[PDB]
Amino acid sequence: SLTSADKSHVKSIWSKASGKAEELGAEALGRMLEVFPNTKTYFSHYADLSVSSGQVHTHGKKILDAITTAVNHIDDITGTMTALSTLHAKTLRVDPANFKILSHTILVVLALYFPADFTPEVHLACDKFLASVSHTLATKYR
Amino acid sequence: SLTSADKSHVKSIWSKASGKAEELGAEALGRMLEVFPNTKTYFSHYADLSVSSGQVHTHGKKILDAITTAVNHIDDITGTMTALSTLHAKTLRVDPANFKILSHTILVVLALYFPADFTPEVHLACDKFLASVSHTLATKYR
Amino acid sequence: EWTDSERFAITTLWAKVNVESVGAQALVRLLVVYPWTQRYFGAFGNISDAAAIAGNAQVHAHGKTVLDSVGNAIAHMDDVADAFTALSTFHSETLHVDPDNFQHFGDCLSIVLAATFGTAYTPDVQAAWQKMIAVIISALSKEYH
Amino acid sequence: EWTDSERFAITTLWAKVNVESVGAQALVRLLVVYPWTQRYFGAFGNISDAAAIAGNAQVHAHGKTVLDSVGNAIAHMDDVADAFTALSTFHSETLHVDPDNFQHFGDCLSIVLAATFGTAYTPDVQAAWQKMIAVIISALSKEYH
Ligand code: HEM
Ligand code: HEM
Ligand code: HEM
Ligand code: HEM
């Protein structure tokens, strides 16, 4: 249910952003933790949860690279995220209600850093996309 | 993401229930309308929204028969409901936040009428199933 | 604001609820149908499959505790938010429970009441119980800020 | 309960919000990203595609009205539920708006504030605005019972 236009839009902003994978991922992760403090417990093993934290930098890059992988395989998001679905469900035990929270902070960060490119249609596309990534990450939960 | 076991469970309760398609559908629809009164506006063209209403009986049967169609094509729910997705999105303009409400009242009615057969695993199966029907009905909304 | 009819639907049905049976059934369903919720209840031991959940004595005991608290909400039904302040804070700040799970539990409770009461759980009676559930959920979600 | 830091994050950013621009942008996004919401706003005419939405004068005017109401919530931030009673009732009983859409709108508003303020919308400032949004959403959802 991503259209051709949606995929074009997602690939466009992603192409314009993916050079800052680490900064964007650190900001989205940091923001999730501060703005939605119910999520802190999952990262409670880190000494610092701020955006300046080295562990947040490292982990933000992983998030954003995994999302890039999905953009690059945008016709098989199910496939690209199935391993990560198992990990979140079975190892990490992340309540899947949290996936929309990180999806939201990623959009916030895209708007912050790329406000001209993050038009309402691009926003639509990206929201569809992260919804499909979230649906895929939830697939192994039950 | 329905397992073999899930499909067995769904087909089982459905086989045990589908003889009361009309009563069950009238009860689920009536219950949605009374218990979640924000949904009444969509059926405001009916003179009577009670479970005894003939228009609710008629429409309940349609709902339940459409769900039976999905049970009978349980490996292609996307396909079975795509026409109905277009209808709800484009003609009827039903806010897709309501789909979970009817899903819930259908489960309530299954439990009411078939409490021995609606075990916790069957409930799981049926909840997965109605979630997939709801996801499918939402597919054409954007 | 409650109507007399709503108050009556709630207190008459409540007078016939076995809080052990209904509470166990409701929590069993929560843990089977929404199995990610199992993460919040590590203290119970093995709750990783349906049969283990349904026979687990700690699940049963906890389900009764929850249904007793629903009884407390009913006794405070004119202001459940105030009465549930500490409990809300507890589920937020100590347990970190995502509030969508209160909705999941409420759904399981309505289902269990339907299964338990059959045709007596009429549409009006269900509507009153859904309102009660919604008020409980809102009270439990409140101290999330 | 607000911290002084939160109060400050809210009132300093608010002092620089153009309610016409931010309010129009936020409602545009609502109507484009969640297009089912277009059903609630028939009075605006053609709002069925992005370009039509973005240029529609009535959308712009309405977006300003919404952002002015956010300003009212801020002036009543110690009790937005009380202040938003009529407004909540209106969106429930007259308009029948499913409350999930308040969350959608809040998300669009946070996004717009990020786009508008850039690096000034720091994580702490966003956290305070998310709390404010949550309090507005809760106030608008309240008279659903
Ligand atoms: C868009 C959604 C998400 C994606 C793409 C994503 C991606 C990832 C990736 C790539 C890893 C690393 C796995 C490894 O190195 O082997 C991971 C780990 C993790 N994820 Fe997520 N994740 C998402 C959502 C979430 C959410 C919402 C939470 C919690 C609120 C969460 C909590 C974690 C935790 C706790 C780890 C382990 C981190 C560590 O130990 O350093 N994830 N995730
Ligand atoms: C499981 C979810 C649902 C299914 C399977 C379903 C199925 C159907 C079917 C089969 C029709 C008849 C179409 C025809 O005769 O051509 C229909 C119509 C309709 N649906 Fe749904 N529907 C669902 C959810 C909803 C929800 C949640 C609402 C509103 C709250 C809704 C409102 C309507 C309305 C207003 C009509 C037109 C009814 C009439 O004019 O008599 N539907 N639906
Ligand atoms: C109507 C909904 C609920 C009510 C009325 C309720 C009530 C309670 C009560 C009374 C306690 C005991 C508090 C004490 O120690 O004094 C409790 C504990 C707990 N609740 Fe809830 N609760 C609800 C929903 C949930 C949900 C949905 C979850 C998780 C998904 C949850 C997780 C817990 C946990 C983890 C504990 C501590 C259990 C332990 O003893 O180890 N609750 N709850
Ligand atoms: C933060 C969220 C929102 C606030 C603060 C807000 C505020 C307002 C205000 C102040 C009005 C004008 C009331 C009057 O006439 O005195 C209004 C009208 C309206 N609102 Fe909202 N609202 C919000 C969200 C939404 C959402 C999400 C929807 C639908 C998806 C909605 C649909 C409407 C409609 C249909 C009207 C009447 C429009 C007309 O003039 O034709 N509102 N709202």
CATH number at residue B46: 1.10.490.10
- Rounded Cα distance between D110 and D122, Å, is 12
The answer to whether the Cβ–Cβ distance between A135 and B139 falls below 8 Å is no
Q: Which domain holds residue B8?
A: 1-142
Nearest CA to ligand 4 atom 42: D91
Q: Which residue has the tokens 């110690």?
A: D78
Q: Which residue has the tokens 């309610």?
A: D19
Q: DSSP letter string over B61-117? A: HHHHHHHHHHHHTTT-HHHHHHHHHHIIIIIS---GGGHHHHHHHHHHHHHHH-TTT
Q: Does C134 touch chain D (CB under 8 A)?
A: yes
The DSSP code for D90 is I
D90: closest CA among D63, D61, D59, D69? Answer: D69
The answer to whether the Cβ–Cβ distance between B112 and C107 falls below 8 Å is no
Residue ranges of the domains in chain D? Answer: 1-145
Residue type, D7: R
Q: How was this structure determined?
A: X-ray
What are the tokens at C7?
Answer: 């108050």
Residues constituting chain C: 145
Residue type, D54: A
- Rounded Cα distance between D107 and A103, Å, is 11
D96: closest CA among D144, D46, D36? Answer: D144
- Rounded Cα distance between C44 and C26, Å, is 16
Quickly count helices (H) and strands (E) in chain C: 8, 0
User: For D32-36, which contacts have Cβ atoms below 8 Å and span 24 or more sequence positions?
Assistant: D32/A120, D32/A121, D32/A123, D32/A124, D33/A120, D33/A123, D33/A124, D33/A127, D33/B142, D33/D104, D33/D108, D34/B142, D34/D101, D34/D104, D35/B141, D35/B142, D36/B89, D36/B93, D36/B95, D36/B96, D36/B141, D36/B142
Q: Which residue has the tokens 């199935």?
A: A82
- Rounded Cα distance between D121 and D113, Å, is 7
Separation of A94 CA from ligand 2 center, angstroms?
35
- Rounded Cα distance between D69 and D71, Å, is 5
Q: State which of B46, B62, B95 you would mutate to test the pocket of ligand 2, scoring each by most atoms of that ligand within 8 A of its C-beta.
A: B62
The answer to whether the Cβ–Cβ distance between D144 and B38 falls below 8 Å is yes
B interface mutation test: which of C25, C28, C29 has the most B CBs within 10 A?
C29
The number of domains in chain A is: 1
Burial code (b: 16+ CB inside 10 Å, e: under 16) for B89-128 equals: beeeebbbbbbbbbbbbbbbbbbbbbbeebbbbbbbbbbb
Residue type, A37: P
Residues 6+ positions from D35 with CB-CB distance below 8 Å: B141, B142, D48
Atom of ligand 1 nearest to the CA of A32: 30
What are the tokens at D66?
Answer: 């919404």
Please state which CATH class domain C1-145 belongs to. mainly alpha
User: In Å, how far from its chain's centre is CA C100?
Assistant: 13
The answer to whether the Cβ–Cβ distance between A95 and C92 falls below 8 Å is no
The DSSP code for A91 is I
C70: closest CA among C34, C36, C117, C20? Answer: C20
Q: Does C131 touch chain D (CB under 8 A)?
A: yes
Atom of ligand 3 nearest to the CA of C90: 13
Q: Is B129 exposed, middle or buried (0-12, 13-18, 19+ CB in 10 A)?
A: buried
Chain D positions in Cβ-Cβ contact with residue B98 (cut-off 8 Å):
98
Residues 6+ positions from C56 with CB-CB distance below 8 Å: C44, C45, C46, C47
**Region of D96 on the Ramachandran plot (φ > 0 left; ψ -120 to 50 alpha; else beta):** left
Diameter of chain D measured on Cα atoms: 44
Separation of A73 CA from ligand 1 center, angstroms?
19
